[PDB]
Amino acid sequence: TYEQLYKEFHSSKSFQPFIHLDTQPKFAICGLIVTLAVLSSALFAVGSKSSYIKKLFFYTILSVIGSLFAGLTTVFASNSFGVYV
Amino acid sequence: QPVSWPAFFFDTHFLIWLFPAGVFLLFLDLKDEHVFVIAYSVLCSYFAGVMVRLMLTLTPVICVSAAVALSKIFDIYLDFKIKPAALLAKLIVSGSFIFYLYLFVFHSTWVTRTAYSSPSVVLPSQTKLALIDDFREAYYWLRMNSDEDSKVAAWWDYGYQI
Amino acid sequence: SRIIWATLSTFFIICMISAYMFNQIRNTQLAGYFLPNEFQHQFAIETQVMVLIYGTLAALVVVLVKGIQFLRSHLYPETKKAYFIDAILASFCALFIYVFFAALTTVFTIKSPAYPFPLL
Amino acid sequence: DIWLSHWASTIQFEEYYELTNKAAKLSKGFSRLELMKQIQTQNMRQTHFVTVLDMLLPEGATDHYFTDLVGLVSTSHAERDHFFIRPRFPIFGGWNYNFTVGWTNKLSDFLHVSSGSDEKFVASIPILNGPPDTVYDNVELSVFLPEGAEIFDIDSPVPFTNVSIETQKSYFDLNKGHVKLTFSYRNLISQVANGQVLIKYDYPKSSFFKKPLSIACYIFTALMGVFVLKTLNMNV
Amino acid sequence: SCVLSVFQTILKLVIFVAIFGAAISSRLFAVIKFESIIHEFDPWFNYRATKYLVNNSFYKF
Amino acid sequence: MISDEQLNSLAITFGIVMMTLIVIYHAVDSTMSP
Numbered sequence A: 001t002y003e004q005l006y007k008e009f010h011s012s013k014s015f016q017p018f019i020h021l022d023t024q025p026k027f028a029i030c031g032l033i034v035t036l037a038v039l040s041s042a043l044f045a046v047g048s049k050s051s052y053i054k055k056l057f058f059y060t061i062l063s064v065i066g067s068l069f070a071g072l073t074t075v076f077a078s079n080s081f082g083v084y085v
Numbered sequence B: 001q002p003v004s005w006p007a008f009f010f011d012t013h014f015l016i017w018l019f020p021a022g023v024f025l026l027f028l029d030l031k032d033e034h035v036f037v038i039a040y041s042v043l044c045s046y047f048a049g050v051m052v053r054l055m056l057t058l059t060p061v062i063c064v065s066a067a068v069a070l071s072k073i074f075d076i077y078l079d080f081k082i083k084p085a086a087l088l089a090k091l092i093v094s095g096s097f098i099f100y101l102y103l104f105v106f107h108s109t110w111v112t113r114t115a116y117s118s119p120s121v122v123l124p125s126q127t128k129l130a131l132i133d134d135f136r137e138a139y140y141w142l143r144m145n146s147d148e149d150s151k152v153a154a155w156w157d158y159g160y161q162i
Numbered sequence C: 001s002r003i004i005w006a007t008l009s010t011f012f013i014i015c016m017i018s019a020y021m022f023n024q025i026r027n028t029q030l031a032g033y034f035l036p037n038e039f040q041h042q043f044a045i046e047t048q049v050m051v052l053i054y055g056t057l058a059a060l061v062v063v064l065v066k067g068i069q070f071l072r073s074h075l076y077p078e079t080k081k082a083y084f085i086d087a088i089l090a091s092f093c094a095l096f097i098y099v100f101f102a103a104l105t106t107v108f109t110i111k112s113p114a115y116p117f118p119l120l
Numbered sequence D: 001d002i003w004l005s006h007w008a009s010t011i012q013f014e015e016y017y018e019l020t021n022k023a024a025k026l027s028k029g030f031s032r033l034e035l036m037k038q039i040q041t042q043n044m045r046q047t048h049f050v051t052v053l054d055m056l057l058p059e060g061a062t063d064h065y066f067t068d069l070v071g072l073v074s075t076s077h078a079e080r081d082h083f084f085i086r087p088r089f090p091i092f093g094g095w096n097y098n099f100t101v102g103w104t105n106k107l108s109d110f111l112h113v114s115s116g117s118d119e120k121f122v123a124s125i126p127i128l129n130g131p132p133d134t135v136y137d138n139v140e141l142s143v144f145l146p147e148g149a150e151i152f153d154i155d156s157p158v159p160f161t162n163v164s165i166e167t168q169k170s171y172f173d174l175n176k177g178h179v180k181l182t183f184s185y186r187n188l189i190s191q192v193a194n195g196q197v198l199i200k201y202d203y204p205k206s207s208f209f210k211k212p213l214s215i216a217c218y219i220f221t222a223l224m225g226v227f228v229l230k231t232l233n234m235n236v
Numbered sequence E: 001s002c003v004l005s006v007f008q009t010i011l012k013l014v015i016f017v018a019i020f021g022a023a024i025s026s027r028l029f030a031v032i033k034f035e036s037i038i039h040e041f042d043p044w045f046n047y048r049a050t051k052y053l054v055n056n057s058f059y060k061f
Numbered sequence F: 001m002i003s004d005e006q007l008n009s010l011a012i013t014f015g016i017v018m019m020t021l022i023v024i025y026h027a028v029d030s031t032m033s034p
Ligand SMILES: CCCCC/C=C\C/C=C\CCCCCCCC(=O)O[C@H](COC(=O)CCCCCCCCCCCCCCC)COP(=O)([O-])OCC[N+](C)(C)C
Pocket: A074, A077, A078, A081, A082, A083, A084, D003, D012, D014, D170, D171, D215, D218, D219
């Protein structure tokens, strides 16, 4: 019903955003420093020398952390340059 | 189509006079690798002497030979492992070539911004800083207001853009 | 030998990047040194002047690399101040690089009249 | 095509017009001399051809653009609430012109959170923005909800010809993609069809954070792919 | 070469980031000033041939 | 979008950071190599 959805529309709150667009490139830069420090220190855990199981362990936990900071960073840096989502 | 020397200074700032000294410095310890750089310098320097689009194959060997001469100078004048006279001389000879490396950036960005960054479609003749897009106006008239199998006989140097 | 082929091929490079064949193909004439405010065209002694310029900066580069141990002994017989004399001599070689490179960008400034880095 | 976006909190309008001028055609062809003298004589009264278009946009519109097929057009003027447009050639009687305009509104005034559930949104979209004197022979209104949205209810004030729900992959749509809810209206008037399309959907936070987690899944499997290609011995 | 190789590897990587930034950002004086469009009379056919490749098959290209 | 003077400042600062860290790499390499 268009009238039920019209009443249900005009009696509602507005969209309160999660993170605004004007603070979001700063999250992109700080997130780039975080995931670049974590992933930049992740290729040297496989890089220098170790055993195998500790190299696998620290590589996979540090690659999980740097990978999720990388994904959230490129969402915010996607929204910063003009394209959205 | 021969070319004059201000295109040689214009396209490469200070690499044009490290280009021969790199070759002469690549003779004095002549491995089998360096015969390629010498022949690729002597040959393609002739071809860019005769033509103008053969400057484009000359451009990499100017960078390689300038990079071997400048790293020989920086090789024997960044050895910081003493005495204040030699240290003062090493700073006054390294700090000159660092200054040319910084001048190369401002030259290479001024030349790019002025002489090689312009559209071939928008024609800013300023008949006032006015832009002119009569080519896209007319060609988009042909795209919009003509039957899609009409044949357009223009002169040949505008043949692709149509 | 090796140095003679080096000097012949390097001098060939000097004569080619100083645009000798624009003076060979396009028959140019001399009037009175340079063509001011005219980028494309060339006088026939400008090739000779630029051979002097490019040749002397390349010569100062190779003196500045493999010419410092040879001129600290040929020009001064003593050995007690080797670092002092060859240090000063390398510094003067850098100074002549700066002078002749200013004598390159000055000539390019009188060729192309609006050049914002004349280095003088 | 409109594009709802919960991460940017913005709605993004893009419109593709294929307009003709059904006025009287002009005899003796077209001559720029008579047109330019007709401009230089007086005042540009009311006549047939099209020189400028007045696009009436929603209230706060930010990033205006106006392109043709071959490139962009620089003769456009985006003043407050009004987007003026000059095409490349003046559209005389019978001539065609296909162009594209676009702008960007904030989402806080087109989208409204429902009351019963926090993760259920209701959007009301302006059905038609354009010049004040136009008649639309075909309209297809594609609204694009984000990747995890699920449409519950659909209401339109104008009786449409068609409606369908598809998906379409835009930038960083690693999974199935945006939910393309597309309406097909046939015969509309610019002045008459004052309406808003009401979509009621949900968009839970389980699917709101799956975008950076999906991009994190590709970066993670790429780097474990790097680990397999560096613990592997190939030395003959 | 205990610590030195790591520091020279990091310097080499930051060097190629600066080289790619200088080698991309110095090209874009005509795209950012006017528009991204194909220039200078010849690559309109290369662009139309690439459009033919991406709309149709490679066997048809 | 970025302007043209700001792109000129971006291109020049990538050039200066580029040549600066090249010279730093060559100094650290030429001092501490056998
Ligand atoms: C290798 C490490 C990362 C390397 C990073 C390299 C470069 C980043 C630096 C600068 C680039 C940003 C400049 C954007 C220019 C304006 C955009 C535009 O205007 O063009 C866009 C093209 O969109 C793009 O391409 C997206 C570019 C996104 C770049 C953001 C950074 C992400 C980098 C990727 C990281 C790895 C990915 C992993 C995925 C699994 C045209 O959009 P449209 O015509 O459809 O407009 C209408 C839009 N509707 C359709 C919504 C209405």
